[PDB]
Amino acid sequence: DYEIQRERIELGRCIGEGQFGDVHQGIYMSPPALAVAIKTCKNCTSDSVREKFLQEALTMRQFDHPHIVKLIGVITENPVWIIMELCTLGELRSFLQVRKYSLDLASLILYAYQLSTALAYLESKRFVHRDIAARNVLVSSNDCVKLGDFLPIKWMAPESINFRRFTSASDVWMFGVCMWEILMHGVKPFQGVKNNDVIGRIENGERLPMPPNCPPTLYSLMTKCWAYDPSRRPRFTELKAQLSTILEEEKA
Numbered sequence: 001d002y003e004i005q006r007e008r009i010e011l012g013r014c015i016g017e018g019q020f021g022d023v024h025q026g027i028y029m030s031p032p033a034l035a036v037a038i039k040t041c042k043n044c045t046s047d048s049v050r051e052k053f054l055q056e057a058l059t060m061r062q063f064d065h066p067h068i069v070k071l072i073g074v075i076t077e078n079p080v081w082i083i084m085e086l087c088t089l090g091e092l093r094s095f096l097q098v099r100k101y102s103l104d105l106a107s108l109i110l111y112a113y114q115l116s117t118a119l120a121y122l123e124s125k126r127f128v129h130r131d132i133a134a135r136n137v138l139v140s141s142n143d144c145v146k147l148g149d150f151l152p153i154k155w156m157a158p159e160s161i162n163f164r165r166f167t168s169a170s171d172v173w174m175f176g177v178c179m180w181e182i183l184m185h186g187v188k189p190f191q192g193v194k195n196n197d198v199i200g201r202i203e204n205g206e207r208l209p210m211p212p213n214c215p216p217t218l219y220s221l222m223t224k225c226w227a228y229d230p231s232r233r234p235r236f237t238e239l240k241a242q243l244s245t246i247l248e249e250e251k252a
């Protein structure tokens with residue numbers, strides 16, 4: 001059980017806006033004062049909003065992995081708060097844009113690898129994420145990223161677009177797009193394309209182009225993620241191993 005007394009929490013500065021409300025950084029004093037992220041919920045006075053907001057916490061207590069944001073606890077009395085581990089450097093997408101001439105290829109491949117370990121862990125728990133995108137990834141330090149979110153047509157597998165089918169294979173399709181976003185320094189996929197035109201493009205065998213400076217072996221791995229037939233896509237355990245070798249060939 002994750003119920004925390006509010007007096008053990010000290011609110012700090014706002015670090016961004018979440019789905020249900022402002023996200024703040026703060027301190028959690030337990031019997032060694034830890035820096036935390038505090039998710040708030042402005043409309044949580046109503047049980048329908050509260051149940052949806054707290055479902056994120058219910059989902060997060062199931063996981064314990066170094067590349068998945070940790071649930072510290074919850075404050076169920078109004079105003080309702082979710083206490084999470086703080087990832088100081090913020091959202092990946094913005095971090096990539098800002099540090100576009102700072103981060104080398106080896107660092108970019110490292111983030112993809114780290115995300116593949118988090119996704120292999122989830123796949124081992126038979127958990128389907130449904131929203132793998134660079135915007136749902138958090139940066140803890142310059143060499144440590146975390147998966148942090150528990151209609152994106154341009155990230156979705158064709159079967160998800162056409163039939164609302166979400167499986168472990170559709171999650172592999174989205175990871176391919178996430179890797180592309182990483183190597184493109186946080187540029188959104190299919191820029192200047194309308195959401196309704198994406199399915200038609202994919203159906204014609206069209207894919208996101210090879211990013212400049214992307215190793216061709218890494219791009220062939222992304223194209224394997226983008227097999228139209230879901231049964232032809234690799235699983236995260238294979239991706240993780242591949243990304244390990246690609247990373248070593250880059251570090252040397």
Ligand SMILES: Fc1ccccc1Nc1ncnc2[nH]ncc12
Binds near residue numbers: 015017037069086148
């Ligand atoms: F909601 C946000 C919007 C922008 C950037 C970050 C966040 N959110 C966060 N920042 C740092 N650590 C975190 N743990 N859980 C969430 C979160």
